[PDB]
Amino acid sequence: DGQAVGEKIFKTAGAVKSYSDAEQLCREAKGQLASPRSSAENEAVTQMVRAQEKNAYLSMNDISTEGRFTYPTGEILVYSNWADGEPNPENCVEIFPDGKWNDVPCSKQLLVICEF
Ligand SMILES: [Ca+2]
């Protein structure tokens, strides 16, 4: 089970992993890391973070061009929800239980939320 918005479904098993391990878990499940593209999608992911009491990874990263955060397609963000002062190396993105985002080191261990 999980939270859905439109045709997108977000799911978690409560796993806590580094970015690379998180990406592999979602891909092996035939999904990808949570990639909220709208307010409504962001709120669905946020509800799951609040339930699990653990910040989660989003998919987006700036490893290709610093400051330019992209999806696994390589396309630029169509939506963002950065915390005050963010983005403030921190190439990956976490989402807080208040729904705001913070760039983080990709070695950080965070909740794994996948989208389908
Ligand atoms: Ca940061």
Numbering used by the authors: 230 to 317, 324 to 351
Excerpt from the paper describing this PDB structure:
A further structure was therefore determined, to a higher resolution of 0.97 Å, utilizing 2,4 methanepentanediol (MPD) as an alternative cryoprotectant. This structure did not show any extra electron density in the ligand-binding site, except for water molecules, and is therefore designated as the native structure. In the unliganded structure, the lack of electron density for the calcium ion at the Ca2 site is accompanied by a lack of electron density, or movement away from the site, for some of the side chains of the Ca2 coordinators. The second calcium ion Ca2 is not as tightly bound as Ca1 (as evidenced by higher B-factor compared with Ca1) and is not observed in the structure without bound ligand. This may be because of a number of interdependent factors including the loss of order of 318–323 in the calcium binding loop, loss of Ca2 coordination by Asn-318, the lack of an interaction between Asp-320 and ligand, and low calcium concentration in the crystallization buffer. In the unliganded and αGlcNAc-1-P–bound structures this Asn-318–Pro-324 loop is disordered. Within the structure without bound ligand there is some ill-defined electron density for the loop that could correspond to the ligand-bound loop, suggesting a small degree of order. However, it would not have been possible to discern the location of the loop without the prior knowledge of the position of the loop in the ligand-bound structures, supporting that the loop is mobile in the absence of ligand.
The collectin family of mammalian innate immune system proteins recognizes pathogens by the repeating pattern of carbohydrates on their surfaces and organizes their disposal through neutralization, agglutination, and opsonization while recruiting immune system cells for their destruction. Bovine serum conglutinin has been shown to bind, through the globular carbohydrate recognition domain (CRD), to specific carbohydrate structures on complement effector protein iC3b, which arises following activation and cleavage of complement component C3 (12). We present here high-resolution crystal structures with and without bound ligand of a recombinant fragment of the C-terminal carbohydrate recognition domain of conglutinin, the first crystal structures of a bovine collectin. The conglutinin CRD monomer has an overall topology similar to that of the known collectin structures.
